[PDB]
Amino acid sequence: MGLSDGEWQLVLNVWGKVEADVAGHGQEVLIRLFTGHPETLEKFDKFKHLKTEDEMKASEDLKKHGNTVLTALGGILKKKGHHEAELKPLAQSHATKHKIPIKYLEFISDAIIHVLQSKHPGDFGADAQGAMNKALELFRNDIAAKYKELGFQG
Ligand code: HEM
């Protein structure tokens, strides 16, 4: 499940593109998640009512939350397989009040690979897509281990 140094280099390289506009990337990721998987939308009190891509873009809160999501994920990814320190608070909040199924983690991960493909193809070739998919599977897997401790499944 671990990533090779090469795979980590592929991940960090593309994250460099996200670094320039974390909020804007986060916005596009959530929009991709919400449009492809509308049931995910139901887990956000604030966004449950945004029916359209224009409405989602018009939401300042959605963009700000997008920033929040990718800022955290950025933290995890730059730690490269020594990341459980930032995972605990993430697992804790996605498995208690919220209750976010692992499969929704998969979906946002797909949304992430999709946005990076579209926006940064020259920095996201096959191996890099492979490596990011791995980094993100590792992340879900680790969170899912913490979900059990937190007593979450359903
Ligand atoms: C890479 C995946 C994700 C990351 C890094 C992430 C990160 C975060 C962070 C940092 C917060 C705010 C503080 C906290 O609660 O820990 C948060 C809150 C939240 N997360 Fe996530 N999240 C991810 C995936 C998801 C998904 C897929 C969903 C639901 C479909 C979700 C649902 C929520 C909700 C509903 C909140 C509170 C929203 C609010 O009050 O605005 N998260 N998440």
Numbering used by the authors: 0 to 153
Paper text:
The seven residue replacements; namely, E27D, V13I, T34K, D53A, Q116H, K118R and N140K, were deduced to have occurred during the evolution from aMbWp (terrestrial ancestor) to aMbWb (aquatic ancestor). From aMbWp to aMbWb’, V13I filled a cavity in the hydrophobic core, T34K added a hydrogen bond, and K118R (interacting with another substitution, E27D) introduced an electrostatic interaction on the molecular surface. Unexpectedly, log S0 decreased during the evolution from aMbWp to aMbWb, and remained almost unchanged from aMbWb to swMb, indicating that the total solubility in pure water has not increased during evolution. The consistent results between experimental and theoretical evaluations indicated that the observed solubility should be an intrinsic property of the Mb molecules determined by their structures. ΔGsolv increased during the evolution from aMbWp to aMbWb, whereas it minimally changed during the evolution from aMbWb to swMb, indicating that the single-molecule solubility in an aqueous solution rather decreased during the evolution. However, the resistance to the precipitant (β) significantly increased during the evolution from aMbWp to aMbWb’, slightly increased from aMbWb’ to aMbWb, and remained almost unchanged from aMbWb to swMb. The folding free energy changes from the intermediate state to the native state (ΔG1) and the total free energy changes from the unfolded to the native (ΔGfold) slightly decreased from aMbWp to aMbWb, whereas they significantly decreased from aMbWb to swMb. In order to verify the significance of the observed molecular properties of ancestral Mbs to the deep-sea adaptation, the PEG sedimentation and chemical denaturation experiments were also performed for extant horse and cow Mbs, and compared with those for swMb and ancestral whale Mbs. The precipitant tolerance of these land animal Mbs were similar to the terrestrial ancestral whale Mb (aMbWp), whereas their stabilities were similar to the early ancestral whale Mbs (aMWb’ and aMbWb).
